[PDB]
């Protein structure tokens, strides 16, 4: 029902070809086991031939007769085999792909045209509800899924089952025993894969839990970067960040350890079962003689038949996820629930006029529970007149204008256009008789001529001319270049808003409506253009019956009748003078109103260079990958020898050889493969593991040892920094992971395959590699064209989608309604191009897959053809033919693994490129010397002379210009300024966060410019507005080690004693040992600040700095901190920039700073004697 038929709906001839393609899909899937049925038949005769060939040791020429005859007979069969299947698989392939396009093409185009139509046909509803953009976003993403759902995936789906159901048919008929054995190994292989999901999901969350700590430390620190710098607590965060990484790495290796155990064991159970299938498969031959090895190989193919089921599930998942998502929204997608608007029939008034009538209308907006904005209404406006409505709290008048256009059916009552109800008449016609001017105009992106043409489809520029000329819009447009053909670029913001609205009036003027609706058209506009547009409105009035709502009473003066609402409740009606006479609601208002990243530059091999530099030793891991590499072909070699000697060899000795090779297939793989895979995994695993440490180490420290506009004023963000730490280290981990993987398969194929390739007849080698690279490139060139079409497809619908998205985001198109079909008209022409392109890719995708399978039969052809014929012609052998199959599985593991790790090499390379350029850094200030920290430098007399400053934004109009100050030791230097900066900046420059553009600053008289960065920050009293508390023990919070300073219990006691935070310290559990409770969630600012104060006097700075410390606070908290602050200072130099001028009254030197320029400076009463900026500051303080 709703699930399937509509998903597939219509398509009369489409449905017919849909089955033809389906039909063609079956015989395609059927062909593959039939192709493998052939493999047994050729095996059978060749085996019978081999049995007599080893059986000779007497006659020779006899072996030259019959054995070659059968082979020649087989050569006769060979030709009809690849061809019979090849011509078959070629044709039906091109057919099954036409399903992917031709069926999908007409369906989607049918879906698109109705969907795009039904949306505009829902009318009011989208404004009533949902997302109106996020909605039309996902929905168009959903229709994209349909192409994946109704495409050849289904054709592929039937193909798989044909190999599945059709595959097992042949198996069971030719025996029921091997099936069961194969049926027995299915859950076991599913069991091992079950270990995987448990391991992956569990180990991911652990690592996530581990790096979360590393992430959390990086989280607050990078936010607290300004805090840590001043106090120089970097090296502690340094050590911790290494500690969390140490744990995150150990969970990493165990994941790798266990993973390799699973992946290793997973393949064991495959090869063991694979061996077990043969051992019981062989036993039915030697002592039994039922199978000649036909089905034995064929039952293996049933596993290949079983893998198609594994290939089937995604296609089902592709269909189902397409089905479910589409049909549920399909109910919304299609039809026209409508039934308040529609498009059609109804009554056409020819009366060419109508007195507007509103009668007892009770209405509510579709917000449901929201109260009725309008409860009852009575308004009747005579023809030719102009009625004015007004209000206060908002809307309720706007409702009356909205209902008149029948945009909302009233709950009770009726609105009568002319004498008749509005609900009888055709809506399309109604909209045309109603012009509407909204307060905020909108212009579609087109010429001004076209935006008017959107008002009425059939029109000529003469009417366009007369329209604007009467609307006085004909001035700015002429001066404007391109004239009427002038486009409106980048949506609607180009020109003056007043001109925009004026055009909208001209648009409504072409409409020549018999009703005119003005909603606050004059509102939200400059005073000058208002009078201009008003005149246009005035010239748009007097000729047409109208109703106007705005908040400008100047325009209401000339109205014939005014009606009060104030919330939508009707009260007064009549002429202006009559209203003012009442001195009512009207009169009352009148007098009252009188995050992305990744710059382009790449690595270019510097990766492995820096990697090996950071990778101290690992030659055992890769060498282990090599011995495992050459291990793979041995399997392909052993099995080749098994059936090889089984095919060519006599009845004697058959048991031992098969027995000997069977065990060999086990121990060479099962014993060794598990070892080497786990052996390498422990190596390259820990390799990537420790790389994750050193990198993130050498990054975060390279990040912390540099600030300088990467931190102070970056265009970046906290998330952007953390993101860098995550992806980069994770990617390069895969980069190295891709290295060993390739080298592993490299020797596995190139190295060993060649050795095997070398023992061929040298033509067989060439002929084989005349296939594999060609089919590889053929598979590659397909991938390019595939994405090439996919991208080109996305671009075409993009332009169509944008102009589509343009329409739905603009809901005002429905008030004119002229463009309803007109918009869908352009979309049709817009959608017409991908349609032909869909037809175009039908042929393109059709030929690609066809050619892909065309190389398949050609491969098996040349394999057995040349394996027969000339080789059959002279010295036909059991070898070199199965070695071809060996070279194939090497060609299969090459493309599969290499192309898989190809994009892994990509994102890593890019991510590595970022992390490399970042780690180069620009260390700037770390240690050096620059000064000797003289014993006479304690003092604290701070000099400022001719200091100018700007934070690193060049044309930012620097806040400091021509600034000079001075402060004596042991006294408070007060500071006060307007807002923002120059307050804060002064304190910042003393931290030497940024060296000023010009001038100099001195502390003992020594040059800060030439002073050591560290020691300058060794004595500082910095206290911010809202102090950031690191999550840790408050005791460890109270004491932040400046350099060597150990946590001192007796000291932090004095800290608490002075900071008056000892109150909380006295009581409460754990006392000093109390954690902040998840980012200090249990404490308020006053408490936090006391601790910050305690942090300051621990260091015992000779210089204290208070940046708006008491700015956020209240009541006793303000006084108790001030008590601490006052007691914190007066022993040493301090600078307070605080905005509290009531508590500044005790200060030694108060300084008035005007935007970089100190205006007045001196003691309070002295400045108080003066007048200027400062006295005003106190005057405004009240």
Swiss-Prot record:
It comes from Mus musculus (Mouse). ATP 1 binds at residues 391-398. ATP 2 binds at residues 977-984. Keywords: ATP-binding, Cell membrane, Cytoplasm, Glycoprotein, Membrane, Nucleotide-binding, Phosphoprotein, Repeat, Translocase, Transmembrane, Transmembrane helix, Transport. It is found in: Cell membrane; Apical cell membrane; Cytoplasm. It catalyses: ATP + H2O + xenobioticSide 1 = ADP + phosphate + xenobioticSide 2; ATP + H2O + phospholipidSide 1 = ADP + phosphate + phospholipidSide 2; a 1,2-diacyl-sn-glycero-3-phosphoethanolamine(in) + ATP + H2O = a 1,2-diacyl-sn-glycero-3-phosphoethanolamine(out) + ADP + phosphate + H(+); a 1,2-diacyl-sn-glycero-3-phosphocholine(out) + ATP + H2O = a 1,2-diacyl-sn-glycero-3-phosphocholine(in) + ADP + phosphate + H(+). The keyword ATP-binding applies. This is ATP-dependent translocase ABCB1.
């Amino acid at each position: 029902v709703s699930v399937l038929t509509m998903f597939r709906y219509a398509g009369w001839l489409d449905r017919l070809y849909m089955l033809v393609g389906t039909l063609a899909a079956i015989i395609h899937g059927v062909a593959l086991p039939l192709m493998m049925l052939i493999f047994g038949d050729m095996t059978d005769s060749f085996a019978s031939v081999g049995n007599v060939s080893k059986n000779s040791t007497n006659m020779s020429e006899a072996d030259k007769r019959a054995m070659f005859a059968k082979l020649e007979e087989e050569m006769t069969t060979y030709a009809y085999y690849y061809t019979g299947i090849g011509a078959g698989v070629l044709i039906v392939a091109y057919i099954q792909v036409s399903f992917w396009c031709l069926a999908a093409g007409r369906q989607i185009h049918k879906i698109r045209q109705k969907f795009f139509h039904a949306i505009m046909n829902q009318e009011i509803g989208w404004f009533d509800v949902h997302d109106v953009g996020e909605l039309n976003t996902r929905l168009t993403d959903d229709v994209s899924k349909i192409n994946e759902g109704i495409g050849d995936k289904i054709g592929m789906f039937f193909q798989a089952m044909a190999t599945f159901f059709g595959g097992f048919i042949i198996g069971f008929t030719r025996g029921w025993k091997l099936t069961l054995v194969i049926l027995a190994i299915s859950p076991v292989l599913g069991l091992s894969a079950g270990i995987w999901a448990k391991i992956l999901s569990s180990f991911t969350d652990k690592e996530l839990h581990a790096y979360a700590k590393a992430g959390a430390v990086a989280e607050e620190v990078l936010a607290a970067i300004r805090t840590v710098i001043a106090f120089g607590g970097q090296k502690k965060e340094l050590e911790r960040y290494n500690n969390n990484l140490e744990e995150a790495k150990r969970l990493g290796i165990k994941k790798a350890i266990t993973a390799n155990i699973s992946m290793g064991a997973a393949f064991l159970l495959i090869y063991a079962s694979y061996a077990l299938a043969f051992w019981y498969g062989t036993s039915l031959v030697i002592s039994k003689e039922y199978s000649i090895g036909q089905v034995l190989t064929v039952f293996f193919s049933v596993l290949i038949g079983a893998f198609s089921v594994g290939q089937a599930s995604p296609n089902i998942e592709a269909f189902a996820n397409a089905r479910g998502a589409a049909y549920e929204v399909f109910k919304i997608i299609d039809n026209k629930p409508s039934i308040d608007s529609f498009s059609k029939s109804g009554h056409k008034p020819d009366n060419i006029q109508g007195n507007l009538e509103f009668k007892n209308i009770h209405f509510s907006y579709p917000s449901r529970k929201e109260v009725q904005i309008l409860k009852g209404l009575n308004l009747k406006v005579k023809s030719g007149q102009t009625v004015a409505l007004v209000g206060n709290s908002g809307c309720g008048k706007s409702t009356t204008v909205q209902l008149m256009q029948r945009l909302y059916d009233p709950l009770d009552g009726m609105v009568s256009i002319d004498g008749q109800d509005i609900r009888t008449i055709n809506v399309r016609y109604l909209r045309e008789i109603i012009g509407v001017v909204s307060q905020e105009p909108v212009l579609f992106a087109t010429t001004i001529a076209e935006n008017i043409r959107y008002g009425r489809e059939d029109v000529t520029m003469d009417e366009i001319e007369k329209a604007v000329k009467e609307a006085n819009a004909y001035d700015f447009i002429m001066k404007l270049p391109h004239q009427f053909d002038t486009l409106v670029g980048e949506r609607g913001a180009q020109l003056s808003g007043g001109q925009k609205q004026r055009i909208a009036i001209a648009r409504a003027l072409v409409r020549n409506p018999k009703i005119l609706l003005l909603d606050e058209a004059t509102s939200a506009l400059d005073t000058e253009s208002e009078a201009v547009v008003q005149a246009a409105l005035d010239k748009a009035r007097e000729g047409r019956t109208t109703i106007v709502i705005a908040h400008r009473l100047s325009t209401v003066r000339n109205a014939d009748v005014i009606a009060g609402f104030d919330g939508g409740v009707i009260v007064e009606q009549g002429n202006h003078d009559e209203l003012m006479r009442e001195k009512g609601i009207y009169f009352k208002l009148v007098m009252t109103q009188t995050l992305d990243e990744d710059v382009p530059p790449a690595s270019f091999w510097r990766i492995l260079k820096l990697n090996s530099t950071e990778w101290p030793y690992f030659v055992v891991g890769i060498f282990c990958a090599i011995i495992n590499g050459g291990l793979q072909p041995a399997f392909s070699v052993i099995f080749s020898k098994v059936v090889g000697v089984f095919t060519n060899g006599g009845p004697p000795e058959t048991q031992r050889q098969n027995s000997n090779l069977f065990s060999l297939l086990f121990l060479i793989l099962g014993i060794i493969s598990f070892i080497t895979f786990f052996l390498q995994g422990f190596t390259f695993g820990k390799a990537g593991e420790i790389l994750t440490k050193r990198l993130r180490y050498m990054v975060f420290k390279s990040m912390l040892r540099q600030d300088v506009s990467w931190f102070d004023d970056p265009k970046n963000t906290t998330g952007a920094l953390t993101t860098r730490l995550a992806n980069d280290a994770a990617q390069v981990k895969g980069a190295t992971g891709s290295r060993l993987a390739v080298i592993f398969q490299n020797i596995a194929n190139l190295g060993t395959g060649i050795i095997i390739s070398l023992i061929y007849g040298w033509q067989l080698t060439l002929l084989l590699l005349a296939i594999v690279p060609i089919i590889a490139i053929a598979g590659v060139v397909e991938m390019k064209m595939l994405s090439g079409q996919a991208l080109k497809d996305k671009k075409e619908l993009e332009g169509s989608g944008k102009i589509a998205t343009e329409a739905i985001e603009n809901f005002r198109t429905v008030v004119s309604l002229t463009r309803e079909q007109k918009f869908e008209t352009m979309y049709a022409q817009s959608l017409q191009i991908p349609y032909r392109n869909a037809m175009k890719k039908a042929h393109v995708f059709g030929i690609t897959f066809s050619f892909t399978q065309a190389m398949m039969y050609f491969s098996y052809a040349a394999c057995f053809r040349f394996g027969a014929y000339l080789v059959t012609q002279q010295l036909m052998t059991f070898e070199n033919v199965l070695l071809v199959f060996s070279a194939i599985v090497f060609g299969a593991m090459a493309v599969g693994q290499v192309s898989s790790f190809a994009p892994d090499y990509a994102k890593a390379t890019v991510s590595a490129s970022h992390i490399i350029r970042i780690i180069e850094k620009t260390p700037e200030i770390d240690s050096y010397s620059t000064q000797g920290l003289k014993p006479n430098m304690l003092e604290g007399n701070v000099q400022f002379s001719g200091v100018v400053f700007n934070y690193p934004t060049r044309p930012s109009i620097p806040v400091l210009q021509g600034l000079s100050l001075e402060v004596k030791k042991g006294q408070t230097l007060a500071l006060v300024g307007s807002s923002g900066c120059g307050k804060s900046t002064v304190v910042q420059l003393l931290e030497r966060f940024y060296d000023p553009m010009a001038g100099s600053v001195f502390l003992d008289g020594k040059e800060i410019k030439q002073l050591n960065v560290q020691w300058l920050r060794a004595q500082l009293g910095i206290v911010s507005q809202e102090p950031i508390l690191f999550d840790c023990s408050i005791a460890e919070n109270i004491a932040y080690g400046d350099n060597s300073r150990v946590v001192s219990y007796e000291e932090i006691v004095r800290a608490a004693k002075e900071a008056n935070i000892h109150q909380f310290i006295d009581s409460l559990p754990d006392k000093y040992n109390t954690r902040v409770g998840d980012k200090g969630t249990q404490l308020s600012g006053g408490q936090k600040q006391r601790i910050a104060i305690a942090r300051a006097l621990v260091r015992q700075p000779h210089i204290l700095l208070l940046d708006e410390a008491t700015s956020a606070l209240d009541t006793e908290s303000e006084k108790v901190v001030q008590e601490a602050l006052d007691k914190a200072r007066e022993g040493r130099t301090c600078i307070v920039i605080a905005h509290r001028l009531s508590t500044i009254q005790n200060a030694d030197l108060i300084v008035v700073i005007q935007n970089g320029k100190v205006k007045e400076h001196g003691t309070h009463q002295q400045l108080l004697a003066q007048k200027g900026i400062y006295f005003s500051m106190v005057s405004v303080q009240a």
